[PDB]
């Protein structure tokens, strides 16, 4: 039995940029051609608690990361092409 | 400009246990008498892609982790489910 101390938990759960898995379809729903391999990507995005419900965990600095994704025409063609995805370099607890 | 190569992305996105932030309410609704600080916890849970939509990313080995959480006001321990090992199994 091991107990993570209050202040350890509060600190590591606090609003920060964290490796987050994001479905490529949910990101780009306008997609009527290609099934994606991988189906999802690991993106550094904001996430975590904020001290009081008044504040929300929001990104202060944003940017794109570029990844070789396999685009599959399920019956027809299939190739590796690059796709950009939003990522969050820095985050904050800001009032809603 | 920098490009992550296909096989790097496929591998890192693959079904694995990953630090996942989980709202303490959404886990335990039966506690409607308390506000929690922190509001959420970082838990090792399954997550990621599976090669084809037929399979779903599921836990093979499960267990509890214990954390000092502030219930509003006293600090008391709470167990949370965590996922030690994961797999791509057919739905």
């Amino acid at each position, epitope marked *: 039995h*091991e107990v*993570v101390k209050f202040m*350890d938990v509060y600190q590591r759960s606090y609003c920060h940029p964290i490796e987050t898995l994001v479905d490529i379809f949910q990101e780009y729903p306008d997609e009527i051609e290609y099934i994606f391999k991988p189906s999802c990507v690991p993106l550094m995005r904001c996430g975590g608690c904020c001290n009081d419900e008044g504040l929300e965990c929001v990104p202060t600095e944003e940017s794109n990361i570029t990844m070789q994704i396999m685009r599959i025409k399920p019956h027809q063609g299939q190739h590796i092409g690059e796709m950009s995805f939003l990522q969050h370099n820095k985050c904050e607890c800001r009032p809603k | 400009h920098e490009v992550v190569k296909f*096989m790097d992305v*496929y*591998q*890192r996105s*693959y079904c*694995h*246990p990953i*630090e996942t932030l989980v709202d303490i309410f959404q886990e335990y609704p039966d506690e409607i008498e308390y506000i929690f600080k922190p509001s959420c916890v*970082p838990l*090792m849970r399954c997550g990621g892609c599976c090669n084809d939509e037929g399979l779903e990313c599921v836990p*093979t080995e499960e267990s509890n*982790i214990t954390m000092q959480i502030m219930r509003i006001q006293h600090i008391g321990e709470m167990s949370f489910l965590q996922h*030690n*090992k*994961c*797999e791509c199994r057919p739905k």
Partner: antibody
């Protein structure tokens, strides 16, 4: 104890199967890992297989490309390796998986070269 | 993926010295941690498992400790045969991850 065969020379891109023979029935009742180690560099878990065979698992840089197989009759563990590069030149150890690794083979050397 | 950070890379001690090797995990591991001794040319030998449990036959001068993230192999009275390379290994969360290694050199 545990005895690895299959190791030796392989062309880049080429495939190789490692077999590892365990001496006793106990093999049938434990998880089984492979750990590898590049010359002079350190240890690195490859992958494991579960007790009945229900589940296989892989370290990140092997997910697309290695398959772990197990024959609970002959008491033999297998590692199929495909798409081999220099990076994969290493001693490959068969080992008893229980979280920690209480039993190792002596390991076999897979050399990837032209 | 839990990142293990072993220290130092290497070190150098005389016979009889107490030696310390540290291991830090990126998440709380709750003693799901082992220490391995590897002598040159041969497979790893398990020393410590479950953080502080000593494998049968391992001398009493090798001891394990720590909790949460931070763990410590202690070789109490260093011997000439303890010349080896020590690794820590996490096994709480797949994939199993080891430290980078600690190459121990004897002075004389």
């Amino acid at each position: 104890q545990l005895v690895e065969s299959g190791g030796g020379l392989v062309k880049p891109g080429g495939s190789l199967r490692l077999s590892c023979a365990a001496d006793g029935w106990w093999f049938g009742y434990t998880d089984m890992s492979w750990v590898r180690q590049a010359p002079g560099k350190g240890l690195e878990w490859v992958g494991s297989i579960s007790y009945k065979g229900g589940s296989t698992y892989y370290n990140t840089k092997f997910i697309g490309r290695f398959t772990i197989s197990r024959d609970d009759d002959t008491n033999t563990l297998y590692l199929q390796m495909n798409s081999l590069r220099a990076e994969d030149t290493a001693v490959y150890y068969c080992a008893r998986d229980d979280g920690y690794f209480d039993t190792w083979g002596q390991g076999t050397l897979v050399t990837v070269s032209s | 993926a839990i990142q293990m950070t072993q220290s130092p890379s290497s070190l150098s001690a005389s016979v009889g010295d107490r030696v310390t090797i540290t291991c830090h995990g990126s998440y709380w591991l709750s003693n799901y941690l082992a220490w391995y001794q590897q002598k040159p040319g041969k497979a790893p030998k398990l020393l410590i498992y479950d953080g502080k449990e000593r494998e049968h036959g391992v001398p009493s001068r090798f001891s394990g400790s720590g909790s949460h993230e931070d763990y410590t192999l202690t070789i109490s009275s260093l011997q000439p045969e303890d010349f080896a390379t020590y690794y820590c290994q996490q096994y709480r969360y797949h994939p199993y991850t080891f430290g980078q290694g600690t190459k121990l050199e004897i002075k004389r």
